[PDB]
Structure formats: C-alpha cells, structure tokens
C-alpha cells in the first residue's frame, strides 16, 4: 500500500520520546514517570488511516485486546486500532523504562556532569 512501517519504528520513536522526557522532567524514583510513559505512548500512534492499517498488519502487536478499559466507546474502528497500538506501546515502553531511568541514574549520580 501507500504506507509501509512496522510497530518497531513506532516503538523506536516512543522510546526516543521516553528518553527525552526522563531527561527533561528530572525523575529520580520509579513512580514519577507514569505521566512520562503515558505521553510517550500517546505521541507515537500514527494518525493516517493507511499508516494505522499497515502497523496493524505488521508483527510485534497482537490482535486481541488486553484490557477493556482501553477500549473507546465509539462507532469508529480506526479509533479502536489506535487504542490497541497505544496499549502495546505503553506496555513495552514501561518494560524498558526501568533500564532507561537506571541509565539516567548515572547522570543524576554526580552534581556537575555524569562523566565529570
């Protein structure tokens, strides 16, 4: 079709946003980044119909829906597809977020620069 991307590219973009946000927001614990992971997952979902169908048809994401709460109550289908992509993104991104914040812990360890 006109669109050819997988879930991997969207995940890479979301991961980049997560790194950027853990840097700006200055989060040092493991509980003040829920907003960060939320926005990282939210600003990653594609918007064009063909793009969303292409990422839907690709590997890395599952057709079944894990949670009923994430399902929007609408007559639109592309909305549901975006919700599913959002759920998958937030799950994997929260899985990697612990290592990302651990990496940022090195930077926050020192008081002038990580490498000094």
């Amino acid at each position: 079709a006109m669109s050819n991307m997988t879930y991997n590219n969207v995940f890479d973009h979301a991961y980049e946003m997560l790194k950027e946000n853990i840097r700006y927001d200055d989060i040092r614990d493991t509980d003040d980044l829920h907003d960060a992971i939320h926005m990282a997952a939210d600003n990653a979902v594609p918007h064009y119909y063909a793009d969303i169908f292409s990422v839907m048809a690709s590997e890395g994401i599952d057709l079944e829906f894990e949670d009923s709460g994430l399902m929007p109550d609408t007559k639109d289908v592309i909305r549901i597809l975006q919700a599913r992509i959002y759920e998958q993104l937030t799950i994997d991104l929260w899985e990697d977020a612990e290592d990302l914040l651990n990496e940022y812990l090195e930077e926050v360890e020192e008081y002038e620069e990580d490498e000094e």
Partner: protein, 1194 residues
C-alpha cells in the same frame, strides 16, 4: 556444539547443588534463620556416637562438624553454602573431563558406563579400580559388592579415593583426606539417581571435548546472580560476581601476540616465529632519529625465563593460555627438550592473580590439563602453579610464629624483628587488611618481595618436613607470603581484561579508596586496573588491555590521557564499536583494545585499526587485512587538538587549521534550573491570556518567553514555551530555584540545544526572551571585535559541525565544549547571516503556531483556490532556493578562508526549513505522494483558519488575533467598533457540529459562506469541489457518491477534532462536548471565551430544542409509511430506530448537563488546560488522553 545446552544447565546445576548443600547442612544440625542468623544443634554424647536429637552423628566426626560450624560462624551460612556448592560443581566437572579423555590411570569411566546407560564402568571393574586408587581393603570392597546389597556406597568411596588421589596430584581443585565436604557430601550423589547422573546424561560427550566449553560453563554457572546483583550498589561479597566476564579468542590472541612479537622483533627479527602466529602488525618507520633511539634502547637478546607474564585479572585464563602457546613456540625456537618445554613454562612466566578463589582453581586446572595434553607425564610430577587468589589476611602472626617454632631452628625472645622478618610479616598483614573488596590494587615494593621469596623458601622447607603443628602454621601463612611476593614483583608484560563496573556499583569503601589513592580517573575501575598495571610494569614493558571507548574520547580523563601520552607511548590501537567486540553481549557497551609501551620515547607514529563498522565474525578477517592504518598521524599531532581525543580521521591540515584561530570561551553561558516545579512554572504559550503576555508588556504580570531547545533548527524557530517570572521570579525564589547568570536575562543573542540527537546548531535568540537551562545561550561582549551575526555564521558552517563531531563524539554538548570551538571574522558573513535569519523568521511566522502570525497565504490572493495553491508552492520553492544559495555561499567563503577542504554528511546538504518537503516529512517515500499530503495539509490548515475566524479569535479584515481576553469580557465593544464587520462572530460562542444545516450557525454553512465571500460568486462551485477533492485525497478516506458539502461536513465531524488536537500538542483551545456513540450532541467552545453561565445557556438553547425536534421527527416517521412493505419501509424503520437511540442518548446528556449546570463552575487560564479539562467532568470529550487519567461520573 551447543553452548546453549550448558548455558541452560549451569544455573540449574547451581540451584540443585545449593539445595543439596542446604539439605545436608540441615541434616547435620546446622540451620539458618529467615533473618540470616545461624542456628547450631548440639549433639549429646549418648554413647559411642552422638546425636542432635534426631540424627545420630558419628562422634569421631563430630569435631569436624564443629570446625564446619566455626567456619560458618566466621563467614555466614549463605556464603559457606555457595562455596560448598561451587566447589562440588567444579570437582564433578573436573572428574567428568578426566574420565572422558581417559587420562585416569585406571582407564575407566566413573560418572557413567560407556555402553550401558544409568550404570558406572567402575562397577564392572571394582577389583581393578579398587586396587588402583584404594589398595587397602580391596577384598572387602569385592566381597561387599558380591554381598548383593546396595553398592552405591562403594561407588561413593571410590569417588572419594579418586578425589584424594587428584588432590595429591593438584591440591587447588581437590580436597585432602578427612575434609569437611566429605561429611557434607550429598546423599543424592550416594543414590541411584544423582546430580552426577543428570550432568553425565544431559551434556553431550562430543561437546565436552573442548576446554573452551569448560570455560563457557564456568561463566554460565554465575548468570542468575548477575541478574539479581545488577540495578543496585554491588555488595563487597557480590563484587567477585561483577568481575565475571568472557573474551573472544581472536582479540586475546591479537593482544598477547602483538606484545610478545614486538618484544621478539626488538630482540632479533630473523627468527621465523613472526610467520607462525596470525595477529601481528609490522611497525613502520618515520625518521632515522627515533629508529636510532629505539635501536639504542632495545636489548640484544633475552632468555625464555627472563620474559615473564602477569595476569592481574586471571578469570578463566584464556589470556594465560595464549601466552602459554606463544611461550611454547619461543621455547621450541630455543630447541630445548620437547617434554621439558611445558615444564619450564609451568615453572615460570605464568603468575596470574584472581579475585575469586574458584576462578583461580579453574584456571590452574586448565593450565594443568593443557600441560597434560602436551605431555602425559606432567601429572605425576605435580609441579605447583603460581595462579593463586588474593585471600583476606586477618590473623595474629605472633601465634603462628610461635607455632612455627621458626624462632629457634634458623634464629620467646623474638629477634627476627631486627631482621625485619616480623616487620615484613605485619607490613604484609596490614597491607591485605580488608583487601577482598579492594582487589589487586595494593602496591608493594620489590625489596619486600625479595625478602618474601627468601621467607617463602623457608616456609617451603618447613612445610616439607618438621613439626605437624609447625606444618599447619606454615600452611596457614604461605598463601599470604606468596600473594605478597606475586603482587610486589615487577613483570615484563601485563596483559589482562579489566573488570567492567557500573556507575556506583562499587562499595562505599571502594569509593573512598579510589578518592584517596588515585586523584585521576577515579570515576571508573578499568582505568584503575590499567594504572596499577603500569605500576607493576617494568621499564620498556607492554601493557595490553581491552577497556571501554569512553575514556578514549571524553571531557573527563583529559588529565589522564594527557599524562599517559606525555610519559608513555602506545604502539597499537584497535577501536571496536558496539558489535565488533564479543566481551559483552549487546550494543550497550562499546570497547577498545590497546597496547601501550612503557617508555615515553617522545613522539612515535602508531598504527590504528577501525572495527566499529562490522561484528566480530567479520572483524576477524577484516583485521587480518585492514584498511585503516592511519600511519600519517603522530603523537605530537594527537596532543595538538582541544581536549586531546584520539582521532582516527585526523588531518594534519585540519589540526593546523584549528590552531592560531580564535575560540570563544566566555560569551556563552548556562541557563537557570528549576527545583522541580517545572510542571507548574513552565507552560505552553497559547494557554495563558495572550492579552496579558504578548500585549500589555508594561505590567509584566503574565509569563515570558522561554527557550529549552528542541528539534535541530539552524536560524529561527523552536520557541513556543513560557515561564512565570513576575516580581523577578518571586515564585521561583520561594521555590528555592537555582538562578544562574541573572545579568543576561531578557537579552539579545544566540541559543543552541544543550543535548541534541542529530548535530550542533545555534539559532538567533531574540531580545527580551528569558533564558533557561537547556538550550544554553551565547552573549556577545560589549564593544567586542566579533558581532553575534558573524559568530552565528561561523558556527553554522559545516566545518564547525565536523569539528564539533570530532571534539565531542557524543551528540551531547556542554559549556566546556563551546569554550573550545574556533571562531573567525569576516565582513560578509554577517550579511548572509542576517539574510538567512530573515528568511527563517518569515518561514516560521508563516504558520499559526507562532504569535507573530501572518495571515493565510491562500486568501491573500484573488482568483482560483488552485491559483493560490500554486502561488504558495512557488513561494515555498523560492524560499528554499534562496536559503540553499546563501548556505552554499557561506560554506564556500569559510572554506576559502580555511584553505583546507572539509566534508560532512547531512550537515551542509541538509537544511532546516518547513518549506522543504523532505525535512518536514519522512523523506523515504519520495513518490510524489508527499506532494499530495502537502496539498491535503494545506487545505486542512485553510479549513482550520476558516473555522477559527468564524468563531471570534481571528477576523479576516484585521491582522492577527483580535480577541484574546478571558471570560468573554471585552467582545461586544469590538463588535460595535467594527472588528467583525466583514464577517460576524457567533455571539453565544457555541459552534454546533449538528446534522446537515439544521441549526442557524452550522459549521458547514458558515464555512461555505466564508469561501463564497473570499472568492466571489462565480468560482465558488469549482473552489468547493477542489477543496473537497483535496480533503478526500489524503486527510480522509475517499467516498463514493459524495457531494462537496457532504465531504466537508464529514471531515468536520470526524478527523477534524483529532487534527486540531495534534496541531496544538494535546493542549486544545477549541474544546469539544460530545454525547457518545450516537453523537446526538456535538459542540465546540472557545477556552478564552468561556463564562460560568455558558453551560446553562447552551443547555437551555441547544439541547431541549433539539430534543423536541427529535421527538417530532420520530413521531412523524412513526406515522409515515404506515403498513408499508417496500425496501424504503425497512430503511425508514431502521432510521427511526437509530434516531430513537439518538433521542435516548440526547435525553441522558441533557440530564447530566442540567445536573452540572447549576454548579456554575468557573476555571482560570493560569491553571492550565489539563487541570481545567479534568475539572469539567465527563461531559467533555476525550479527557483520558488530554489529562492522562480516567474520567469520573457523579
């Protein structure tokens, strides 16, 4: 082969062995608490034997159990358990390897039987193996075997005897007779089913033939512990686990071969050895002077015993094995006896120290077995090995000396104090105090090791014969003496792989140790090891190690790198990337392998090898035939560069260009840091009342523009955030926020992103903007010889980009970096710079996001909408061409001034401009589909501007936003004055997204009126068709049998709210109210034009009339088509059912809206759109994404 099999089995082996140790200790009466406390059971002496009350222990063995209890009390339950389990696993693997190769004297298979599964060959030949290992009571064993009862006890005794014989052969891996582990031996190993059975039937015998597999399973035996330890500060007891690594064969071969071959070629080159090994590089020549100097310093010849090898981090021992191979080659060159060569290599030039005891044991086992493969008679001789582990020494030397009776046999009246013997003893004892966590970082002089060798020979003689208690004392004392001698002696070559730490993984005691004893490179541990190896390296030695690549090029270690290049020279480089090295699995780590010559030798030209390009499997034969020699580079060339990084792509012309050139280090400064209230102190620009921030500048009561630094921008843009600074930032002062460089606040200059992901770029930073940390700024000095425009032009050059990439390989930048980049001066650079900044300013002000908003370019031109689109595209391409011409001119003039050609990638050929299609899009789909996407986006932006102008923020007759106040205050006066005389604005402030043209102010009717008014009455039909086609092209899916007005209405209903949300980055200002699935009620309200009474007003003026209309319609349709059976009858029945559902939904929404309306809540803009969106309730649309929280119902 399959390393995955042992990789899976080794942790399970660890688990089962730990379980066996725990169960056996519990059956011995030794128990552990949930708090870790040790519990001891006392065995009463009932009779000949003893019993703890449940288990009848042998009385004779009871003192051994008490010794084990004392060991546990001295160390701890868990540490003793893991020690025992690890030792038993090592012993079982050793015996398995021994029997598989048939090196055993009896020549049978102990762990299993070659022909019969679940059986032992020793059971077949019990008489023979018994007469072999346990000559006593062979007849007893035979008759007990034929007695007909269980023989697994006999198998256990045979294994014990074999272990005793092996200990007599090598003692490090096997225990002596009557040991504690003997009483702790698992009963499962005495059973038909045993751990030995599982490991002998699981692991393939063909896979077992390789000693590399043995090292692999040694490393795999600690995997889950590594999983648990990471993520927190590594405890001292867990430090040896963190020092567990594996290295690929080829890199180890390269290091050891390069060192020993450099020594060999220095001695004499005619030897044919250089043909023998594979990985070695021939040194080149530059000038006769350095060659004469090195010929003067090189020795004429050496002896095999003269050259010695040190291994500070022994580990498994691959490095030592490769050293063994090359040393064997050297000895063969000498021509000594074939079977004496391995013995000579074992006796000397091995050494090697380890942190863990059992790692040293396994290394010694590997050395002994390699010698056994070389010569089968070595095992009988039993030569002691120099591979030992640093053992903690916290014993009283006086008691041992009294036990040694040393005072009278060779010299109570202690007089060896005058002979410094007691002095060296307690010096060594103090040196090793709490050294287990320290590692091999203890320095000792050489006189000490000379005296320690003398005393070690004395202890050897004492242990050979004499008093039994003196023998025990000598055995207790010997490891400390020998480890002190090894750690104090100097060595010819030190090649090892340092341990890989984590940021703060080391213990606090280690932090203090590094802080006090090393003022340089104290932030890591690999540099610790390499510096200490240089301390242990003699004159003209070689130090070859595989460290990280961070300290090759980093702002820190600049003193370290400078000192090492000033006092040492490095012969060979090998810069591997994230995949070339196999030391760490994964791309997270990136390592480099180097070998450094001990002598400074002034300036010498090194050879360099690049490996980041590919992975190890390729990098082997890539290194065999390299293409990155870079011999032209010289030591003085490397030191002449800012920060002294080792540059692989260094040009002498480039470095000469860097010198004699000005470089600013004062004008650029750092911003201010907020103490954690950023969520409340920084906000988006259009959220606040524009009437108070952009206008009414005298009050300054509202916020001010701020800079943070986002996407790479070259000249202008990336400023859409504001920060509160009223009363000189009174709120920040009450927040205890760090404010640095307050004097440059609201000042003109330039700003560059502190930590970028693509490159270095600084853009013009306008006057009156507040300056914050991140996106740090530069400020030209007063009456400075350099204008800010010239500096911006110089920094925008691709030469500066390449220099920045070179000086700081990491994309992150800092103030120290901008203190270093060079700058020049010219009288035409600033003019090109100002042209470029004006162009970029126009491009950035072309859109609605910037507050210096310029009106939509389509409505500015009269005629056809396609005509306006063509004109807009013409403007875009004209802007792009002018920008690229200016950039090329700047690059050419700076190149002419420099005089040395420079090349970059995606720096000069790429420009940052929204007009440039490839920059704003993916650039990988250049199929002209992006042109269609551009068309659709332009039409959508036109529609958004039209709907905004309809609703009161924008007036087409005036310029810019005309209403920006809060609370719908100050809008009637504008109407009376004539702001909206050309196009009226909906008074109630409510835009209904209702059905087709039912309400008075439906969005479709208003937008049709707008497009008619702008472009006359004759072209409106074709313009509407063109807009509909553009919408159906890319923004929305094409539809069949759809009119233009239907198309625009469908776009407004769906995929317009989403686009508006995306445009403002989840901070909408045209808030949407919806009813649900039926979409019975849909409305849009302006945030800045929201009043507390608006809810009830719209509830009584937009809901109940719609409800009445729905009721009348359903009644009419119920009356219509009575007793009808055509297709239209079914269609109307379905439609009436649908609007029945819609009526029910509308009634529910009316109920909820009336319930919320009586409250008459009011919101404040300064709060933020997120909190207000949360406060409104469930009547609002899509709150979960905006506020990141589930909605609530009341």
């Amino acid at each position: 082969m399959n390393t995955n099999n042992i990789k899976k089995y080794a942790p399970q082996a660890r688990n089962d062995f730990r379980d066996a140790v725990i169960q056996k200790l519990t059956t011995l009466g030794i128990a552990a608490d949930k708090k870790g406390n040790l519990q001891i059971a006392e065995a009463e002496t009932i009779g000949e034997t003893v019993r703890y009350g449940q288990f009848d222990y042998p009385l004779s063995t009871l003192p051994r159990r008490e010794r084990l209890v004392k060991r546990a009390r001295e160390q701890g339950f868990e540490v003793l358990v893991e020690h025992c389990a690890y030792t038993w696993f090592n012993r079982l693997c050793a015996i398995r390897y021994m029997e598989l190769h048939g090196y055993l004297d009896h020549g049978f298979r102990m762990l299993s039987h070659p022909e019969t599964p679940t059986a032992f060959e020793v059971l077949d030949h019990v008489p023979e193996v018994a007469e072999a290992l346990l000559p006593e009571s062979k007849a007893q064993l035979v008759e007990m075997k034929l007695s007909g009862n269980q023989d697994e006890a006999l198998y256990r005794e045979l294994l014990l005897g074999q272990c005793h014989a092996l200990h007599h052969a090598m003692p490090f891996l096997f225990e002596a007779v009557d040991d504690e582990a003997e009483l702790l031996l698992p009963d499962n190993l005495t059973r038909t089913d045993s751990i030995l059975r599982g490991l002998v039937d699981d692991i393939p015998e063909e896979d077992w033939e390789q000693v590399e597999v043995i090292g692999w399973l040694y490393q795999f035996y600690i995997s889950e512990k590594k999983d648990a330890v990471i993520g927190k500060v590594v405890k001292s007891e867990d430090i040896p686990a963190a020092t567990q690594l594996f290295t690929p064969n080829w890199i180890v071969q390269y290091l050891v071969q390069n060192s020993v071959g450099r020594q060999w070629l220095q001695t004499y080159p005619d030897s044919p050895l250089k043909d023998k090994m594979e990985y070695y590089i021939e040194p080149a020549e530059q000038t006769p002077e350095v060659q004469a100097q090195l010929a003067a310093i090189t020795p004429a010849s050496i002896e095999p015993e003269s050259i010695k090898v040190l291994d500070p981090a022994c580990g498994s021992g691959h490095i030592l094995t490769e050293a063994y191979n090359v040393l064997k080659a050297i000895y063969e060159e000498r021509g000594y006896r074939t079977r004496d060569i391995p013995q000579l290599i074992l006796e000397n030039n091995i050494f090697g120290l380890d942190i863990d005891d059992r790692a040293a044991q396994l290394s010694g086992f590997a050395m002994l077995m390699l010698a056994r493969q070389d010569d089968r008679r070595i095992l009988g001789r039993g030569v002691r090995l120099n591979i030992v582990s640093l053992q903690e020494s916290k014993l009283d030397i006086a008691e041992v000396w009294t036990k040694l009776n040393f005072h009278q046999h060779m010299q109570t009246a202690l007089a060896n104090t005058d002979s410094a013997e007691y002095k060296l003893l307690m010096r060594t004892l103090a040196l090793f105090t709490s050294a287990k966590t320290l590692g091999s970082l203890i320095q000792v002089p050489q006189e000490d090791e000379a005296a320690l060798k003398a005393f070690l020979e004395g202890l050897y003689r004492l242990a050979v014969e004499g008093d039994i208690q003196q023998k025990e004392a000598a055995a207790e004392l010997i490891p400390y003496i020998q480890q002190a001698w090894i750690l104090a002696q100097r060595y010819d070559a030190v090649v090892a792989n340092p341990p890989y730490m984590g940021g703060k993984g080391m213990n606090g005691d280690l932090k203090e140790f590094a802080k006090k004893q090393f003022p340089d490179s104290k932030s890591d541990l690999f540099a610790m090891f390499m510096q200490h190896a240089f301390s242990l390296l003699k004159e003209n030695g070689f130090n070859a190690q595989v460290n990280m690549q961070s300290w090759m090029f980093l702002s820190s270690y600049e003193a370290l790198r400078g000192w090492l290049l000033d006092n040492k020279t490095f012969i060979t480089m090998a810069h591997l990337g994230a995949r070339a090295f196999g030391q760490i699995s994964g791309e997270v780590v990136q390592t480099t392998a180097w070998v450094i010559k001990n002598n400074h030798s002034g300036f010498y030209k090194p050879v360099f090898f690049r490996l980041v390009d590919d992975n190890e499997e390729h990098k082997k034969n890539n290194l065999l035939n390299r293409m990155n020699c870079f011999k032209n580079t010289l030591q003085n060339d490397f030191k002449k560069i800012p920060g002294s990084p080792i540059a692989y792509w260094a040009t002498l012309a480039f470095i000469n260009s860097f010198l004699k050139l000005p470089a600013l280090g004062t004008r650029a400064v750092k911003g201010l840091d907020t103490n954690g209230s950023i969520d409340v102190f920084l906000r988006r620009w259009p959220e606040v009342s524009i009437n108070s921030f952009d206008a009414l500048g005298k009050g300054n009561s509202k916020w001010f523009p701020i800079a943070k630094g986002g996407e790479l921008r070259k000249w202008f843009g990336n400023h859409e955030y504001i920060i509160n600074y009223e009363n000189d930032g009174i709120e920040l002062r009450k927040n205890k926020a760090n404010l640095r460089n307050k004097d440059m606040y609201f000042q003109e200059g330039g700003t560059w992103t502190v930590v970028s992901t693509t490159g270095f770029s600084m853009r013009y930073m306008p006057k009156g903007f507040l300056f914050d940390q991140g996106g740090s700024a530069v400020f030209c000095e007063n009456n400075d010889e350099l204008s800010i425009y010239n500096i911006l032009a110089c920094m925008n050059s691709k030469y500066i980009n390449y220099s920045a990439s070179l000086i700081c390989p990491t994309l992150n930048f800092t103030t120290g970096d901008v203190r270093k980049f060079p700058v020049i001066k010219n009288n035409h650079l600033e003019d090109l710079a100002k042209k470029a900044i004006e162009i970029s300013k126009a491009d950035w002000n072309q859109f609605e996001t910037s507050w210096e908003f310029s009106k939509n370019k389509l409505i500015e031109h009269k005629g056809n909408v396609a005509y306006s689109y063509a004109s807009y595209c013409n403007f875009q391409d004209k802007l792009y061409e002018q920008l690229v011409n200016i950039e090329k001119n700047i690059n050419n003039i700076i190149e002419e001034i420099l005089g040395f050609k420079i090349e970059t990638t995606e720096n000069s050929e790429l420009i940052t401009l929204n007009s440039n299609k490839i920059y704003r899009y993916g650039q990988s789909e250049t199929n002209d589909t992006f042109l269609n996407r551009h068309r659709s986006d332009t039409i959508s932006e036109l529609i958004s501007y039209s709907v905004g102008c309809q609703m009161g923020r924008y007036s087409l007759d005036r310029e810019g936003l005309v209403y920006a106040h809060e609370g719908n205050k100050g809008f009637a006066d504008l109407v009376a004055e004539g702001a909206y005389k050309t196009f009226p604005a909906d008074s109630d402030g409510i835009l209904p997204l209702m059905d087709d043209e039912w309400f008075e102010d439906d969005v479709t009717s208003r937008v049709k009126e707008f497009v008619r008014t702008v472009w006359g009455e004759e072209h409106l039909q074709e313009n509407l068709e063109f807009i509909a086609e553009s919408l159906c092209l890319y923004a929305i899916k094409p539809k069949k049998g759809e009119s233009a007005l239907e198309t625009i209405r469908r776009y407004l209903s769906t995929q317009f709210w989403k686009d508006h949300m995306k445009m403002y980055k989840k901070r909408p200002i045209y808030w949407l109210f919806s009813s649900g699935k039926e979409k019975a009620f849909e409305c849009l309200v302006y945030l800045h034009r929201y009043n507390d009474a608006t809810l009830s007003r719209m509830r009584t003026e937009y809901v109940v009339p719609l409800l009445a209309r729905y009721q009348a319609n359903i009644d009419r349709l119920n009356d219509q088509l009575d007793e009808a059976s055509g297709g239209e009858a079914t269609r109307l029945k379905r439609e009436r059912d649908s609007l029945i559902k819609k009526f029910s939904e509308l009634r529910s929404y009316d109920d909820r809206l009336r319930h919320y309306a009586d409250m008459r809540i009011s919101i404040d803009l300064d709060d933020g759109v997120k909190v207000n969106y949360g406060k409104f309730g469930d009547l609002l649309a899509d709150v979960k994404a905006i506020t990141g929280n589930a909605p609530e119902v009341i």
